[PDB]
Design a protein around this ligand. Structure first.
Ligand code: CLA
Ligand code: CLA
Ligand code: CLA
Ligand code: CLA
Ligand code: CLA
Ligand code: CLA
Ligand code: CLA
Ligand code: CLA
Ligand SMILES: CC(/C=C/C=C(C)/C=C/[C@@]12O[C@]1(C)C[C@@H](O)CC2(C)C)=C\C=C\C=C(C)\C=C\C=C(C)\C=C\[C@@]12O[C@]1(C)C[C@@H](O)CC2(C)C
Ligand SMILES: CC1=C(/C=C/C(C)=C/C=C/C(C)=C/C=C/C=C(C)/C=C/C=C(C)/C=C/C2=C(C)CCCC2(C)C)C(C)(C)CCC1
Ligand SMILES: CCCCCCCCCCCCO[C@H]1O[C@H](CO)[C@@H](O[C@H]2O[C@H](CO)[C@@H](O)[C@H](O)[C@H]2O)[C@H](O)[C@H]1O
Lengths: 216, 204, 192, 81
């Protein structure tokens, strides 16, 4: 319904399907490895949700500091928080490598469990977790587990509203992926936060664009 | 056969006119939603009643002070004034008491006639048969107003238009405090002193 | 009847002790999930009930509070000189290990109880006085759950107030609210 | 810089290459050149909104060739003149 040819395998059942596949990466003729047609939509949704979180969290502290909710000691840009110590560093209750080890432990639990549910759909609700295995049996589609935890308010009770919510999720996710790429490139070129870049383009739109910032 | 707010103007189909004060005035087409009209009428009732309460609480003190009976401070700086209790403590007490009161009102609005019974003493049984007019001994002690058909219409029209007048008047008073550093009745005195050289266009 | 006029949930009809049809988020649709939540609420509440006198009485006599206990209340040294007359008993190697081992043991033994009806109420071979049969069971359960809910919210208030005011206790807060009722309450931190 | 000679040369080169692409004055995705340079028609499974058959691939190719020719012309003119 938009973009490029209807590839004869993107019929339209997928949420956000517009037949955009110039390189034919999702052609099911030879579809082994990680280029399986059942893996690419899930991977798109996952980098998309993580990108939504990343964009919101990389723009939030600077806006909050400008308004004044949080102390200005924590209103630093996203690349001055510890991801890149050579650029800037902040002192937390632990050094960043202990934080990395703890983060890898927790995300290892969560992600290896999610992977085992993807590969073995019925699992993760059979063996004894610490009481929570009852709510951790994903129903049907791996990308939409649901249940009393992952959907604890009850949205999308009927099919059509669920379709609209899925489409909205896909678009906000793609938009956030592009936004995060913009954050990276604008950080490299300008050396300041994305919010400062927005204010600069707003103050003098003609003299504060990518063509001016060719000299760093 | 009902007079309109605009002569020769067709009234909206949903604006039947049965409700008091319905003069077919809805230029924005806002109240066309089927589920919005009851919320609109309840909100207008609450707005008019609190607006007229505030209108009394604003106009009476300034009028009495300028007459000379009382010597009270103005409203637009009363919040920043010496009080025995801390301002935040008072505000929290206010929000809690209003939480109870409106909670009761909201339960009445959502579920008709469901909270007319006092929990602690179940022997009270509020008498109000219409939403937004609970009546009862606490809110309608004397029992005035409640009568036959077409009797309620005129008095409710009086109430709603009196509340409208008070609400617009209090908006005017706040605009005065924003534009002039003196009470609205003093602005009336100024408008009386030089009427042709003291209006809105003078010191806009 | 947590809110009069609101329909009760189909599963929450008001049969078990402490039922008032309160589940707006809808977590009790599964009967077994409802039973597990009942057990968890009762455990959290009972532990709060047991802990609350143990944290109000020492301050009532004038011993210590949250910050004192967590920083220096003979807890990190001194061989337990806190309890009136100094008594050695144990120290860090003991009061840091025997408590955790005992709590792990009791939690593991509780986990090994098959009957969910006993999970929500231990009942048998526990009662020394045997007052379970003596009084009405439903009234006793209702009183227990109501006092437990009160204890739970009171303990949450204790934690929040201790966080808000370091080196303080609930009793001095009560004294401050008694002596200066209209100048020391939630407002001092809601509107600083 | 906008009115400069370099900008004019670059925009002219890119515009002329795109013009020769969209209208059948140069090879493109849907118009193959033979050994005699005849521009026969070729069918590709690429869908485009342009009614003449000009696709995004052709846009990229013509823009690239235009930038290349413009850079060459600009450098040559700077070196000679
Ligand atoms: C000469 C280097 C070379 C070449 C030509 C390929 C070629 C290929 N790899 Mg591959 N690969 C390579 C090195 C290479 N690999 C190395 C060094 C690793 C280890 C990191 C991998 C790990 C890897 C994985 C894990 C996967 C591929 C896949 C693929 C196929 C599609 C990949 C794509 O679209 O891009 C394709 C046959 C994918 C595949 O088989 O899908 C069809 C796939 O899932 N490759
Ligand atoms: C995903 C993601 C990740 C990896 C992070 C990571 C981080 N955030 Mg964060 N954040 C996120 C999403 C995320 N956020 C979202 C969605 C919002 C909204 C925020 C709002 C937020 C604020 C307001 C602050 C952080 C801060 C921080 C840093 C310290 C966090 C801490 O102390 O605990 C850390 C780099 C803190 C910081 O940078 O210092 C800080 O003040 N975040
Ligand atoms: C101008 C003065 C005035 C008059 C004549 C009435 C007249 C009436 N009010 Mg009323 N009312 C007023 C001001 C007035 N109200 C104000 C300022 C408030 C806010 C404090 C209220 C709050 C109020 C309530 C809460 C109720 C009435 C009710 C009534 C009716 C009995 C009657 C129509 C009752 C009613 O309509 O029930 C039948 C009723 O329940 N009034
Ligand atoms: C019926 C209500 C009412 C009444 C009796 C008054 C009365 C008065 N206003 Mg007024 N005012 C009102 C509503 C009202 N106001 C509202 C709702 C607004 C906001 C738009 C204003 C905005 C306003 C300004 C900006 C000023 C006054 C001023 C005055 C005084 C001189 C008369 C002139 O203004 C004519 C009043 C109006 C045109 C009312 C506005 C439209 C209404 C609702 C009709 C006089 C005491 C002036 C003053 O202080 O003395 C010179 C002045 O500068 N008013
Ligand atoms: C719910 C279980 C529980 C737990 C884990 C504790 C834990 C504690 N209590 Mg305690 N206490 C409890 C119930 C509990 N209490 C009850 C129900 C009462 C009322 C009789 C008390 C009355 C009490 C007093 C009077 C004192 C303590 C004190 C203490 C601390 C030193 C250890 C001790 O003497 O008591 C655990 C050892 C045997 C029970 C320790 C943090 C002392 C302290 O320093 O308080 C800050 C202290 O002086 N407790
Ligand atoms: C369980 C019932 C209960 C009771 C009797 C009290 C009683 C008290 N609280 Mg309190 N509180 C409670 C629950 C309770 N709290 C809960 C559940 C919370 C968490 C939201 C708090 C959070 C809280 C704060 C943040 C503060 C109080 C404070 C106070 C004291 C001042 C009077 C007041 O605010 O009331 C008073 C002794 C104030 C205080 O002690 O400062 C002097 C204060 O600043 N409370
Ligand atoms: C001057 C040369 C020139 C050039 C370089 C282009 C280039 C383009 N035209 Mg185009 N066009 C031209 C002249 C030109 N046109 C003329 C003269 C007309 C009038 C008949 C049109 C009418 C036209 C239409 C109606 C559409 C295009 C569209 C397009 C784009 C197709 C992209 C694609 O693959 O969609 C996949 C492409 C950028 C399509 C598009 O997507 O534009 C955004 C489209 O719908 N063109
Ligand atoms: C206005 C047209 C124009 C003009 C005047 C020039 C002029 C020049 N070009 Mg040039 N060029 C042009 C268009 C033009 N070019 C175009 C359209 C392209 C394709 C992109 C090129 C690609 C090109 C390359 C790749 C090179 C030149 C070079 C040169 C220089 C000559 C070196 C030479 O021939 O040694 C004689 C060489 C042999 C006999 C072998 C000279 C300044 C060369 C240069 O800059 O050297 C300093 C060089 O390397 N040109
Ligand atoms: C996951 C992601 C971003 C995640 C960000 C995170 C977690 C950020 C975290 C933090 O910032 C915070 C919050 C706070 C900081 O203090 C610390 C860090 C830790 C830095 C982006 C993905 C980003 C992903 C992107 C940009 C993907 C782009 C893909 C494109 C364009 C594909 C195009 C095509 O594939 C199609 C569609 C069809 C094919 O046929 C043809 C082609 C053309 C190949
Ligand atoms: C949509 C539309 C349209 C169009 C428009 C336009 C405006 C277009 C254009 C387009 C364009 C305008 C494009 C362009 C492109 C370009 C390119 C693509 C380029 C590239 C470049 C390059 C590739 C270079 C490279 C290089 C070289 C070679 C030299 C050295 C350096 C470097 C390496 C860089 C039409 C009309 C149809 C219709 C209307 C609307
Ligand atoms: C492939 C990677 C994609 C993602 C890239 C993310 C952005 C990485 C580049 C960040 C660009 C900002 O870098 C720019 O500002 C930094 C902080 O003011 C500067 O950092 C400088 O100042 C800091 C603060 O005083 C000091 O702690 C540094 O030691 C000093 O080098 C860099 O010298 C400058 O180049």
């Amino acid at each position: 319904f938009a973009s490029k040819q209807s590839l004869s395998y993107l019929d339209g059942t997928l949420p956000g399907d517009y037949g955009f596949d110039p390189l034919g990466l999702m052609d099911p003729e030879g579809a082994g490895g990680f280029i399986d047609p059942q893996w690419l939509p899930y991977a798109e949704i996952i980098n998309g949700r993580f990108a939504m979180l990343g964009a919101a969290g990389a723009i939030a502290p600077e806006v909050l500091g400008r308004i004044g909710l949080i102390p200005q000691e924590t209103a630093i840009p996203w690349f001055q928080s510890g991801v890149i110590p050579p650029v800037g560093n902040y002192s937390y209750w632990a050094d960043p490598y202990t934080l990395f080890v703890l983060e890898m432990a927790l995300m290892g639990f969560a992600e290896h469990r999610r992977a085992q549910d993807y590969y073995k759909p019925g699992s993760m609700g059979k063996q004894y977790f610490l009481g929570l295995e009852k709510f951790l049996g994903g129903s049907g589609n791996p990308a939409y587990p649901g249940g009393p935890i992952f959907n604890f308010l009850g949205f999308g009770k009927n099919e059509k509203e669920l379709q609209e919510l899925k489409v909205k999720e896909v678009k906000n996710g793609r938009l956030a992926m592009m936004a995060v790429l913009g954050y990276f490139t604008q950080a490299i070129f300008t050396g300041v936060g994305p919010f400062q870049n927005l204010l600069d383009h707003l103050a003098d739109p003609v003299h504060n664009n990518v063509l001016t910032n060719l000299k760093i | 056969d009902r007079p309109l707010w605009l002569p020769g103007s067709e009234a909206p189909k949903w604006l039947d006119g049965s409700l008091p004060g319905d003069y077919g005035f809805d230029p924005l087409d806002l109240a066309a939603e089927p589920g919005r009209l009851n919320w609109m009428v309840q909100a207008e009732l609450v707005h008019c009643r609190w607006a007229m309460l505030g209108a009394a609480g604003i106009f009476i003190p300034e009028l009495l002070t300028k007459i000379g009976i009382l010597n009270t401070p103005s409203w637009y700086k009363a919040g920043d004034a010496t009080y025995f209790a801390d301002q935040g403590t008072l505000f929290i007490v206010e929000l809690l008491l209003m939480a109870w009161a409106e909670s009761r009102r909201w339960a009445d609005i959502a579920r008709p006639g469901s909270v007319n019974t006092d929990p602690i003493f179940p022997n009270n049984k509020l008498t109000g048969t219409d939403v937004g007019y609970p009546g009862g001994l606490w809110f309608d002690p004397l029992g005035w107003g409640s009568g036959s058909e077409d009797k309620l219409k005129e008095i409710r029209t009086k109430e709603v238009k009196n509340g409208r007048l008070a609400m617009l008047a209090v908006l005017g008073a706040f605009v005065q405090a924003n534009v002039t550093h003196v009470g609205p009745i003093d602005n009336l005195f100024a408008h009386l002193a030089d009427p042709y050289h003291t209006t809105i266009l003078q010191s806009l | 009847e947590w809110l009069p006029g609101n329909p009760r949930p189909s599963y929450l009809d008001g049969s078990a002790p402490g039922d008032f049809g309160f589940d707006p988020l809808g977590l009790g649709e599964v009967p077994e999930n409802l039973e597990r939540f009942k057990e968890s609420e009762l455990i959290h509440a009972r532990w709060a009930m047991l802990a609350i006198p143990g944290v109000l009485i020492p301050e009532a006599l004038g011993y210590g509070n949250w910050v004192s206990a967590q920083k220096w209340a003979a807890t990190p040294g001194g061989q337990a000189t806190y309890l009136g007359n100094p008594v050695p008993w144990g120290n860090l190697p003991i009061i840091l290990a025997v408590e955790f081992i005992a709590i792990a043991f009791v939690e593991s033994q509780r986990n090994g109880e098959s009957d969910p009806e006993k999970r929500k109420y231990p009942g048998g071979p526990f009662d020394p006085l045997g007052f379970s049969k003596g009084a009405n069971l439903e009234e006793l359960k209702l009183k227990e759950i109501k006092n437990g809910r009160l204890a739970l919210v009171a303990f949450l208030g204790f934690v929040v107030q201790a966080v808000a005011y370091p080196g303080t206790g609930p009793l001095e807060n009560l004294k401050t609210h008694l002596a200066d009722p209209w100048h020391n309450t939630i407002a001092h931190v809601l509107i600083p | 810089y906008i009115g400069s000679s370099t900008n004019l040369i670059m925009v002219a080169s890119t515009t002329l290459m795109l013009f020769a692409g969209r209208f059948g004055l140069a090879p493109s995705a849907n118009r193959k050149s033979t050994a005699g340079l005849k521009l026969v028609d070729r069918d590709s499974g690429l869908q485009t909104g342009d009614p003449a058959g000009f696709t995004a691939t052709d846009t990229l190719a013509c823009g690239a060739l235009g930038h290349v020719i413009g850079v060459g012309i600009v450098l040559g003119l700077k070196a000679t003149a």
